[PDB]
Structures are given as structure tokens and as C-alpha cells.
């Protein structure tokens, strides 16, 4: 696989190059957010195909990872955009919401997204770290619920775990490079991966409130 | 907070709760109601021991009573589930709820929506077996779930969060120490730390799905039990 041969610096360059653009909301809250999310999803599919290791998977496994990860990926993008806007969520440059506007439908999810944004600000999360985390969410979120037990599904799981190890090495490289001690490198890697557990929780609560792209995702692939 | 990695391991190993038995001789085969009854009874007894264990996790009693209950409210089902997965590791294809309650996949079907959670728990047990998860690593992970699960959903609140993040950094140092001691290279140490923490995201998912399936078919209880824990001889 090409992925497993990349250095830390090449993995970061590939992921930075694959970054989708920040979209605007069209010139009702759910309507505006659905329209924005629908446009972001088309870019997310094309971004996913550029994450090293992702296109080495079967179509079926690519769709499963996207089905499991799509809301977590929208949410980490939102939190990243909102970082320099304490108390607000920057859905788009023309759709900056504060807590009060959560009340429209959602306030609980808003509060959890605001807390994540604060955590990233407090940690001084870097763009190189952000693109690594977003790639981890894509590969990790669905890896434990692959249904099959064929030789091919075992090889797919193994491949995903190897790419996840490459992204871990990349995060450690970025931290070493910034001059963190070995202890600081391991502590910061832990703090970043522990935030992924909160993003999973926010995604699940989001869906609970709602009750979505179907296994739609295949055609789009 | 001033402890060594070696002392952190000793404290966590020493604080481990006991393994409980299921209610003896229930009517077998099970119905939906009688399985849910057995599991509710076991979980209710395990909760008393979880509170006692939580009070011995370094840093936990430094929090306010309100913040202790908030962490337990957020973490209790994840903690029951990682204990189940740990007990089940030496029983491929089965979940060891108790030494006298070993279930295979098919029994999950008795309760609607439970077979999906069973399958996810069996996959986690396989992942731990494949990684050769060690007891000293398991007690570290269980402590991380307690301190991490509720920390982001708690005001000069800021001091409590800072304290929890420092204790979490101490448990990370402890995990790395255990891996170093075992003879893993620096690369292997960081990869294994990442693989263990990435499984916590799947345990969170299983916990959320568990609750969703329940409501398809708490703070106050935990506060009384925590309050009452101060009155225990
Ligand atoms: O979890 S949410 O609050 C969700 C997060 C944020 O706000 C909602 C929203 C969104 C996303 C997709 C949509 O189609 C519509 C809205 C968000 C968004 C949009 C674009 C982003 O770049 C980033 C985030 N949420 C609330 C509800 F439960 F009340 F409905 C929800 C909505 C729809 C779902 O499907 C599942 C959950
Ligand atoms: O997620 S489960 O599969 C869940 C996993 C496994 O099996 C179920 C079960 C369990 C746990 C607790 C029980 O009371 C009964 C059963 C397990 C277990 C038991 C002992 C273990 O050592 C390890 C695991 N599940 C059912 C579904 F899948 F069918 F939907 C489910 C059931 C009940 C739930 O909460 C009940 C509210 C109780 N509160 C009330 C407020 C105060 C705090 C307590 C949440 C989810
Ligand atoms: Cl657009």
C-alpha cells in the first residue's frame, strides 16, 4: 500500500491537500443546516477517497466507514471552525450561532460542541493535528462493526489498523517536531484521542434527537 | 497527583471490585422479562461496588459530590461493559455476565435489540484477546473511562476539569510505563496507547446504543448511594 510507505510529513501534506473548502449557508434553522450539511457531504465523500488507505478498501467497507463517521466528521469540522469564536458555533462564515439560537429545535448538542471547541482552544490544537484526528474518526468509527468474517474482511481490518498506526506515528512526529518532550508527546496523544470519545457521544446524541444517508453512500462512491 | 506510575498501578489493582454471581437457579430457558430481571439484579449489586471502587481511584474524592455523581452518571454503563468484556476474554463467542451466567450470541435474541449490543461486546472481547490486554492495562482503561466520560459536560468548574486532566495525564504516564517495562519500543508504546484509547470510542458507542435500546423498550439514585457510602461501616 502506498499509505504505509508515507513519512509523517507526506501523510500531513496529503491530508492538508485533501481538506475540503469552508462552504456558505444559502443566502428556518433545520432547513439552512440540512442544505449546508447536504453540500458538505458531497465534499466529504471526495475527501474520504483522498485519505491514504481509504480507496484500498472495498466499496462496501468504504460506505460502512462513511455511514458510521459522517456526523462525527461534520461535528469536528464545526468545532475546528468555531475555535476562535468563544461562545459561538461557526456553521458557516455567514451562519455564526450563539447558545440562545440553540433553543430553536439542540441546545444540549450546542453546549457539548461549545465545550469541545473550548477544549481545542485550551490545547492550542494545530491544523496538522486536526486533519490527523478527522482521518482517525473516518477509519476508527466503523472498524469494530464490520459484519463479515471472510478472509477479505480480516485483511480490511488489519489494513485499517496499520493506517491508524501510521496516523499515530504522524501525530507523535508533529509533536516531536514542535519540541514536546517524550512525556508531553504521549500525554498530548492521549488527550486528543480521549476527545474522540466525546465526539462519538455528541454524534450518537445528535441521531437520538433526530429520530441521514443510507447504505445513498454507495451510489455516491 | 504526587504518586509514581508504580504506585498508581498498585492503588488501581488494590481497588478492584469483586466478581458477583447472578441470582441462583432462575427458570431456564429465559423470557425477555426474566433475562432483563437477572441482568438488572446483577447490575444493581455491581453498582454498590462500583461506587466503592470509584472512591479509591486517585483524584476522584478530590471532586465535589455533585461532580463525582456526574462522572458516575456518565460512565456507569461503559464501566459495567468493560468489566463484562474483560471477564469474557477467555470465553470466545460467549459473554461471562457472572461465573454462573455465561451467554452465547443466541441468548442475546431473548431481548429485542440486545443481540446487536451482544455482537459489539463479543467484537470488543476479541479485540482485547488479539491485543493480549494485560490486567494492569485494564484497570488503567477503566479509570480513564470514569474520569474522561463526564469531564467535557460539567465558573472558576475550571479547577475541577484541570485536576481531572492532570490525573488522566498521570494514568497515561502509567500505561506508557507498563508498556516500557514490558519491553515495547517507543513506537510500539505510542501505537498500543492509541489502539487502547481508540477502543474507548467503541465502548462509548455500545453504552449509548444500550441506553437507546432501553428507552426503546438516575443522578438521584447515584447521589443517595454516594451519600450512603459515607455512612457505611
Ligand atoms: O446533532 S445535531 O444537533 C446536528 C449537528 C449540527 O446541528 C445538526 C446539524 C445538522 C446536520 C445535518 C442535517 O441534515 C441537519 C442538521 C449540524 C451540522 C450541520 C453542518 C455542519 O457542518 C455541522 C453540523 N441534530 C439536531 C436534531 F437532532 F435536533 F435534529 C441533528 C440533525 C440532523 C441529523 O441527521 C442528526 C442530528
Ligand atoms: O445495553 S444493554 O444491552 C446492557 C449491557 C448488558 O446487557 C444489558 C445489561 C444491563 C444493565 C443494567 C440493567 O439494569 C440491566 C441490564 C448489561 C450488563 C449487566 C451487567 C454487567 O456487569 C454488564 C452488562 N441494555 C439492554 C438492551 F440492549 F436490551 F437494550 C441495557 C439495559 C439496561 C440499561 O439501563 C437500565 C437502567 C438502570 N439504571 C437506573 C438509574 C441508576 C443507574 C442504573 C441500559 C442498557
Ligand atoms: Cl457550496
Curated annotation (Swiss-Prot), chain A:
Expression by tissue: Widely expressed. Not expressed in the pituitary gland.
Region (Transactivation AF-2): 7-221
Region Interaction with AKAP13, residue ranges: 1-221
Cysteines paired by S-S bonds: none
Effect of substituting residue 215 to A: Reduces PELP1-mediated activation of transcriptional activity
Outcome recorded upon mutating residue 62 to H: In ESTRR; results in highly reduced activity
Post-translational modification: Phosphorylated by cyclin A/CDK2 and CK1. Phosphorylation probably enhances transcriptional activity. Self-association induces phosphorylation. Phosphorylated by LMTK3 in vitro.
Domain NR LBD: 7-221
Annotated region (Self-association), positions in chain: 1-221
Effect ascribed to mutating residue 132 to A: Loss of hormone binding capacity and temperature-sensitive loss in DNA-binding
Residues anchoring lipid (S-palmitoyl cysteine): 132
Outcome (variant: residue 87 to V): Destabilizes the receptor and decreases its affinity for estradiol at 25 degrees Celsius, but not at 4 degrees Celsius
Superkingdom per UniProt: Eukaryota
Amino acids binding 17beta-estradiol: 40, 81, 209
Subcellular location(s) of the protein: Nucleus; Golgi apparatus; Cell membrane
Modified residues (Phosphotyrosine): 215
Subunit structure: Binds DNA as a homodimer. Can form a heterodimer with ESR2. Interacts with FOXC2, MAP1S, SLC30A9, UBE1C and NCOA3 coactivator. Interacts with PELP1, the interaction is enhanced by 17-beta-estradiol, the interaction increases ESR1 transcriptional activity. Interacts with EP300; the interaction is estrogen-dependent and enhanced by CITED1. Interacts with CITED1; the interaction is estrogen-dependent. Interacts with NCOA5 and NCOA6 coactivators. Interacts with NCOA7; the interaction is a ligand-inducible. Interacts with PHB2, and UBE1C. Interacts with AKAP13. Interacts with CUEDC2.
Disease linkage: Estrogen resistance: A disorder characterized by partial or complete resistance to estrogens, in the presence of elevated estrogen serum levels. Clinical features include absence of the pubertal growth spurt, delayed bone maturation, unfused epiphyses, reduced bone mineral density, osteoporosis, continued growth into adulthood and very tall adult stature. Glucose intolerance, hyperinsulinemia and lipid abnormalities may also be present.
Extra facts: Selective estrogen receptor modulators (SERMs), such as tamoxifen, raloxifene, toremifene, lasofoxifene, clomifene, femarelle and ormeloxifene, have tissue selective agonistic and antagonistic effects on the estrogen receptor (ER). They interfere with the ER association with coactivators or corepressors, mainly involving the AF-2 domain.
Domain free text: Composed of three domains: a modulating N-terminal domain, a DNA-binding domain and a C-terminal ligand-binding domain. The modulating domain, also known as A/B or AF-1 domain has a ligand-independent transactivation function. The C-terminus contains a ligand-dependent transactivation domain, also known as E/F or AF-2 domain which overlaps with the ligand binding domain. AF-1 and AF-2 activate transcription independently and synergistically and act in a promoter- and cell-specific manner. AF-1 seems to provide the major transactivation function in differentiated cells.
Function: Nuclear hormone receptor. The steroid hormones and their receptors are involved in the regulation of eukaryotic gene expression and affect cellular proliferation and differentiation in target tissues. Ligand-dependent nuclear transactivation involves either direct homodimer binding to a palindromic estrogen response element (ERE) sequence or association with other DNA-binding transcription factors, such as AP-1/c-Jun, c-Fos, ATF-2, Sp1 and Sp3, to mediate ERE-independent signaling.
Record-stated family: Belongs to the nuclear hormone receptor family. NR3 subfamily.
Protein name per Swiss-Prot or TrEMBL: Estrogen receptor
Species assigned in the record: Homo sapiens (Human)
Residues included from the entire protein: 305 to 544 of 595
